[PDB]
Amino acid sequence: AMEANIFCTFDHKLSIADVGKLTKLVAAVVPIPQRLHLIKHYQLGLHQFVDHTRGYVRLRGLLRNMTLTLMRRVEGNQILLHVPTHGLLYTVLNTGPVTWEKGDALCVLPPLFHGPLARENLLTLGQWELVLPWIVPMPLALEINQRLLIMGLFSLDRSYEEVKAAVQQLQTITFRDATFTIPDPVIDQHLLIDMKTACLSMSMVANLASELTMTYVRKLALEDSSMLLVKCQELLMRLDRERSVGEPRTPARPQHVSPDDEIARLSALFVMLRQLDDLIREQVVFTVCDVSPDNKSATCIFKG
Amino acid sequence: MAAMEANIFCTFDHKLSIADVGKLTKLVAAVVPIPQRLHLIKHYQLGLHQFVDHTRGYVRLRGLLRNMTLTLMRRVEGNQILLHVPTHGLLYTVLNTGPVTWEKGDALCVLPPLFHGPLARENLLTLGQWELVLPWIVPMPLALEINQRLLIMGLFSLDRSYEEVKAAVQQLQTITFRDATFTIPDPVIDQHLLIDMKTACLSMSMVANLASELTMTYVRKLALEDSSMLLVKCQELLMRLDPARPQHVSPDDEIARLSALFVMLRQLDDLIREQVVFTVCDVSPDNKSATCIFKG
Amino acid sequence: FEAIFGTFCNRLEWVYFLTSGLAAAAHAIKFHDLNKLTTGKMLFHVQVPRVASGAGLPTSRQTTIMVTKYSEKSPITIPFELSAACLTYLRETFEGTILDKILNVEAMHTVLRALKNTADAMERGLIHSFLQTLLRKAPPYFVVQTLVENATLARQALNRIQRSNILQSFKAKMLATLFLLNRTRDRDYVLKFLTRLAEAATDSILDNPTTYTTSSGAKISGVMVSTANVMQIIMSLLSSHITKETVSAPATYGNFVLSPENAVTAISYHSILADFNSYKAHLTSGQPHLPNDSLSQAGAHSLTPLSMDVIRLGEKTVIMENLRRVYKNTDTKDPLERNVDLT
Amino acid sequence: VENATLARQALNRIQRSNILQSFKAKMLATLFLLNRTRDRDYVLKFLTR
Amino acid sequence: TQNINTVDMGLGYTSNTCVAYVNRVRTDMGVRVQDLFRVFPMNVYRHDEVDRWIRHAAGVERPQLLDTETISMLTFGSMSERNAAATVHGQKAACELILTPVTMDVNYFKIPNNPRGRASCMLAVDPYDTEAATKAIYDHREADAQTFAATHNPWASQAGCLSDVLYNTRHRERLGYNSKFYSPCAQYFNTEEIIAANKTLFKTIDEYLLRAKDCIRGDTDTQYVCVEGTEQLIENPCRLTQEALPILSTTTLALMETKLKGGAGAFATSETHFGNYVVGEIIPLQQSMLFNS
Amino acid sequence: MENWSALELLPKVGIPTDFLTHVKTSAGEEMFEALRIYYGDDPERYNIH
Amino acid sequence: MENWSALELLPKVGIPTDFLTHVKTSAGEEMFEALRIYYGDDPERYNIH
Amino acid sequence: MDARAVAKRPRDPADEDNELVTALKAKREVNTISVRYLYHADHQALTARFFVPEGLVEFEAQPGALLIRMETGCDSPRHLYISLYLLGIRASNVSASTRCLLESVYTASAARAALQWLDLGPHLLHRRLETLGCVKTVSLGITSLLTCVMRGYLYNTLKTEVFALMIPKDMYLTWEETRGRLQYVYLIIVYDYDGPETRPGIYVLTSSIAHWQTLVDVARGKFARERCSFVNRRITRPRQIPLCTGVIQKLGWCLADDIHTSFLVHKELKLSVVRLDNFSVELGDFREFV
Secondary structure (H helix, E strand, C coil), rough: CCCCCCCCCCCCCCCCCHHHHHHCCCCCCEEEEECCCCCCCCCCCCCHHCCCCHHHHHHHHHHHHCCCCCEEEEEECCEEEECCCCEEEEECCCCCCCCCCCCCCCEEEEECCCCCCCCCCCCCCCCCCCCCCEEEEEEHHHHHHHHHHHHCCCHHHCHHCCCCCHHHHHCEECCCCEECCCHHHHHCEEEEEEHHHHHHHHHHHHHHHHHHHHHHHHCCCCCCCCCCHHHHHHCCCCCCCCCCCCCCCCCCCCCCCHHHHHHHHHHHHHHHHHHHHHHHHHCCCEEEEECCCCCEEEEECCCC | CCCCCCEEECCCCCCHHHHHHHHHEEEEEECCCCCCCCCCCCCCCCCCCHHCCCCCCCHHHHHHCCCCCCCCEEEECCEEEEEEECCCCEEECCCCCCCCCCCCEEEEEEEEEEEEEEEEEEEEEEHHHHCCCCCCCHHHHHHHHHHHHHHHHHCCCCCHHHHHHHHHHHHHEEEECCCCCCCCCCCCHHHHHHHHHHHHHHHHHHHHHHHHHHHHHCCCCCCHHHHCCHHHHHHHCCCCCCCCCCCCCCCCHHHHHHHHHHHHHHHHHHHHHCCCCEEEEEEEECCCCCCEEEEC | CCCCCCCCCCCCCCCCCCCCCHHHHCCCCCCCCHHHCCCCCCEEEECHHHHCCCCCCCCCCCCEEEECCCEEEECCCCCCCCCCCHHHHHHCCCCCCCHHHHHHHHHHHHHHHHHHHHHHCCCHHHHHHHHHHHHHCEEHHHHHHHHHHCCCCCCCCCCHHHHHHHHHHHHHHHHHHCCCCCCCCCHHHHHHHHHHHHHHHEEECCCCCCCEECCCHCEEEEEEECHHHHHHHHHHHHCCCCEEEEEEEEEEEECCCHHHHHHHHHHHHHCCCHHEEEEEHHHCCCCEEECCCCCCCCCCCHHHHHHHHEEEEEEEEEEEEEEEHHCCCCCCCCCCCCCCCCC | CCCCCCCCCCHHHHHHHHHHHHHHHHHHHCCCCCCCCHHHHHHHHHCCC | EEECCCCCCCCCCCCCCCCCCCCCCCCCCCCCCCHHHCCCCCCCCCCHHHHHHHHHHHHCCCCCCHHHHHHHHCCCCCCCCCCCCCCCCECCCCCCCCCCCCCHHHHCCCCCECCEEEEECCCCCCCHHHHHHHHHHHCCCCCCCCCCCCCHHHHCCCCCCHHHHHCCCHHHHCCCCCCCCCHHHHCCCCCCHHHHHHHHHHHHHHHHHHCECCCCCCCCCCCCCEEEEEEEEEEEEHHHHEECCCCEEEEHHHHHHHHHHHHHHHHHCCEEEEEEEEEECCCCCCHHHHHHH | CCCHHHHHHEEEECCCCCCCCCCHHCCCCCCCEEEEEECCCCCCCCCCC | CHHHHHHHHHCCCCCCCCCCCCCHHHHCCCCCCCCCCCCCCHHHCCCCC | HHHHHCCCCCCCCCCCCCCCHHHHHHCCCCCCCCCCCCCCCCCCCEEEEEEEHHHHHCCCCCCCCEEEEECCCCCCCCEEEEEEECCCCCCCCCCCHHHHHHHCCCCCHHHHHHHHHHHCCCCCCCHHHHHHEECCCCCCCCCCEEEEEEEECCCCHCCCCCCCCEHHHHEECCCCCCCCCCCEEEEEEECCCCCCCCCCCEEEECCCCCCCCHHHHHHCCCCCCHHHHHHHEEEEEECCCCCCCCEEEEEEEEECCEEEEEEEECCCCCEEEEEEEECEEEECCCCCCC
């Protein structure tokens, strides 16, 4: 009885055939919304977090707060579940689309069903189903997050075909031993609100920092302890072609802004960053040591 | 040399009153930073109080606290103090000091102490020209609001008259958070900010060049069509004025520009960030205890 | 109904190294502290006999000759594993329900199979690594045949004519002996060939007074191994000479316990010589010769009978042996089954 | 029986081809027995085989 | 784990092996030449249109390897040759060497001899005499070994000849090539090895029991070089002699019928017909291997 | 280079030593690893350090 | 380099060793031609071979 | 449930019989295997075997090194493991005398493929590398089988000797004048953006600093010269978008007091190297900064 375990139950009675489809996921990651003990299967899995109008960002941000929990052993009307300790090795399962390689960093991401059918699901049971997150290697995961944000930047201008031709290519990732079509956040023309909520956060600093920062560069420039500020003011021109005596040699600056309103422009500058921050970084949930043959199970040391 | 000991004994030279030892028993499992990590530290090294200075700068206490090694108090038998050092990634009980509701599951960060409404700091330990100033453990969102304002305080002062500087400091020093009010003791413009204030303004500048023109025009196009409660507020934050199709579609070059932008938001956004430590699981109904995992 | 008649499972064979006839080629010994040693050696000494010179010819002074053999080292390793699922039903029994006991009895036999599948493998690996070594000490027959033919003439280091004459037999013996049973199949020509092998084999330095001995005092020497398809032929053509016999094989491995005096020398300067206490008395007595040199002193006093085959070749009762019994169903290629390129 | 022992793995494409080579050489040489040679040692060897 | 320690207690050799009984032959005993285009992929014609006409005539593919892939291609090599859809026989090989039309075949092909056209046994050479050892195998002021004519094959015996730059492993190593393909002829041209191969007689055969054996993968169609260990080692008797074995061959179908119609000794004899000739067979495997089955 | 000065002073064991190709022919072809032939008596052995 | 591992295992004698300037001071003065001082317990002494 | 059951101290595995022994105890049947004491039952350190090409075994044969994986666009090998010493020919920080020294050791053709692959791509070097751990118990052969550490102290089996970690002297630097009682080892890569090509610039850097903020502040000291270059490249080359002036990542920590200079000896050539002693491994992912 040395091992700690999280028990689970089933409201619906399982079919005997259904019990064997959990035994194919003995090592699969089974994220849990909150650490507990007894847990109903409705609480189990990512399926309870499914949303309609809400976009992909809601599924991912809640996943960061979820307590990842490896499957242990099915036992009749129960589900053993152990939450890994930091720094110990564990045999996880490569349910992810891309085959693992030894030593790769890993970070959990929500599953992304695409266009043409392939693998679908096995554990349907009364509306609710046991969806599982992908376990993509980290360097690929940075590429995935970059696509969904940029594909939403074009959501405003679907009307022209040349934009649609580009999003069609960004949709098709091309990496080792794999090709996939990451689903377009755009649907029913207008973008889902969670992406539009995030896309503004990039456009804020892309625009709000294009005026507010001009005042604070000139004052710090007097020190020149690092000398870079003399050139840093010319970094703000936002141009490619060389200037041709049009005389915009110095940046435009805000004019006679109210001292209270001036604080509000900065106070709101960072609250946008607090919303955007969730996509900026990916914790390394696992670090594989040596992949097992058949690219199924793989021993990994837990991290985080 | 032996690796720094897991268990630390702290012993006080000054004789302690019974009123003092009773406060320590309720102080058990509080976060008590230490610098030396010696097996048998003196109480002078104990606490943050010895680093206090005439400037009383809240900024310098922030960076000095980051060099501290957090420890959890345990077993306050007699005069001895058992400051166990938690291992990374294991569960540990935690006892609050600063009055904060602590919603379950939020990230925690050690923070320099503030003050509530009494201003007395009452039930604090005074001990012969010495005090035990334990830094607050605070929820992560409070750690952002307490710090993102502090970065602004050095910026706004740069262009304003001294009468207008105090007018802003008077407002920014107070911070409401989860019903309870809070206020920052003695904010101080200093060289400790200037070393950080410059790189922030430098990070503000490099992002202005990294952005594609479509990334900046995305809202000005959005205002032309869609309307929303958020979009109306954004126009108040921006200058009013100063389909033609995008000028250049180079997706291989567009995505490469975004990767450099993430380097900035892993940097510039991190200036207001403090490293997360405890991760709450189940808060006690008294909000005086909570299990926690993971360290900075 | 779909009836299912009773299931079957194969019974394991019990191979052993000492029971095998390949062990006759080895003087097996146990030595617990083997991991520490780096290299072994055995120095030799040979002074040459000489004959009187005639008049008008240069004479020959006595010529001392000494040489030192070394010892190669090789290891072997067999993985085996138990699932943590089945492993945890071992010690961690639950309630004593009749169903729960079955997983305990099964897991206890999962370990007995996991060990004896490897314990049986450990014996076969000594069969395999030892035969693998002999192939590195097994020059092709036409090379050894040239030696016995012209060894006697080249008393000096070989002359440029002698080296050319040695090369001449390398080819003439290669074009005919390259295949045997594929070509000529005279019952006498095979016996005339195989009896020539035993004359070409130099004797091992140590001698065994009693181990591996035919009943009624015949002294066994030599051994050979082959695939069953070749031995199936040899049992027929030479049946007149082949006879079964209960060889007196040793019952247990020998041992090489360290002398207490060696324990100081192992630390003092990282070297050892066997039976160091024995050498001391022989210097004080002044006697040169010693009764034994450790390796023949290394135990193995016990002996047990077991049936084997032998042949009468040159009055040398060579052991016969077949390795088909120990490589069946194994996933490794049989070392005796090889191939030969011809340009 | 002549080739079973070497092929511990599922048969190689070279192994399968040498398996086929025996199918031709044996089918003709053994196409008929008493119609061809009637040697006593040969049939006694063929039958025990 | 286990830690055995073998000891060479024998003064002279205590063990020996003699090859005995063939049961099968993996080799196709074929004719199709080695495709140098798969052995030296990087080589290309200078003119653009010419290479389009060459590969179309040879039938060889012209892959567009990426600059990344070419670098690993030149080092570890690869199994570039596609496996045949069906192989009734087995692995094929036939390395090619251009030689003189006026080769003295009567003094050469009738008996085993060096493919280089100048015999280069190292056992005949004085051991540890690199100067003399490299002279007899290259410099032609000295009389040749075997036949004493200085060189039957000037385009092969010479250092730097087309056979030497194309098949010596060190001259090949300077060129880009796929190491995994196995050329049988290379063993006769390893100047940086064969010149150092010479030793005292007993030490020579001892090295013959180690490095002399070559690996060949057993499941692939054509032969490929492989890492030693997992595959069974293959000794070559010719390495000790450095002299290749002649086989039966006929200039025309007519002379071939006389051999097939003859008795058991018919393969051993050699015959000629004006300018046509028939090489004899030194090892009568042809009658033996098929009849022996 | 081993310790040849020891071997002729250390007590040994007389053993039969049949083998092919003389004895100088075998040791002179370096079939053994270390060796130290000399055609006279050896002055160098009585020294000890 | 000497053979310090022999000294770390071989039994010795209980000889009193008073001398000037502490003892660690002697290690810093190189008063002895060779030494191998170390602080914590040394695993390396068990490396017999 | 029993009051004695909570009275019990936490279970001692060493007092208990081995799992292989226990099944044999039920049958009382001796086996040839010595089950009395399973090896590696006590090691907190985690490890995994790495097959390696024979041409890169050098320097690693001495215990204590750094195996960083290198992804490649070739389909085979897909991941060529790289020694840190092999990377020294590439780093600009190495002295031309030190660079010429080890470069002669890397004459193997398999080592030649590594330099060809770092140069051909447009991607930055840090993206293609991945820290794994440290050498111990080299197998040595045509395909070396290193037992690289994942998280823990390097040492010989049965704890007989604690392997030191080796670091070249040119790549090591000390920011602090007075060492602390503890100091983490942060592996660091810093580009110096310029013109025709971006050279790397490796610097392993032990430091008492632990927090990320103060760690990257001192990193802005001597590396500020690249900071002037990374900005100057931006105004110089529109459309071109250089990124990451440098990268920091944790590698482990050391007792500081045990550190001292040393030198490796391989292929006759000597090479002075800083020598960490009790280097516990604690892997850390690359962290970007400008």
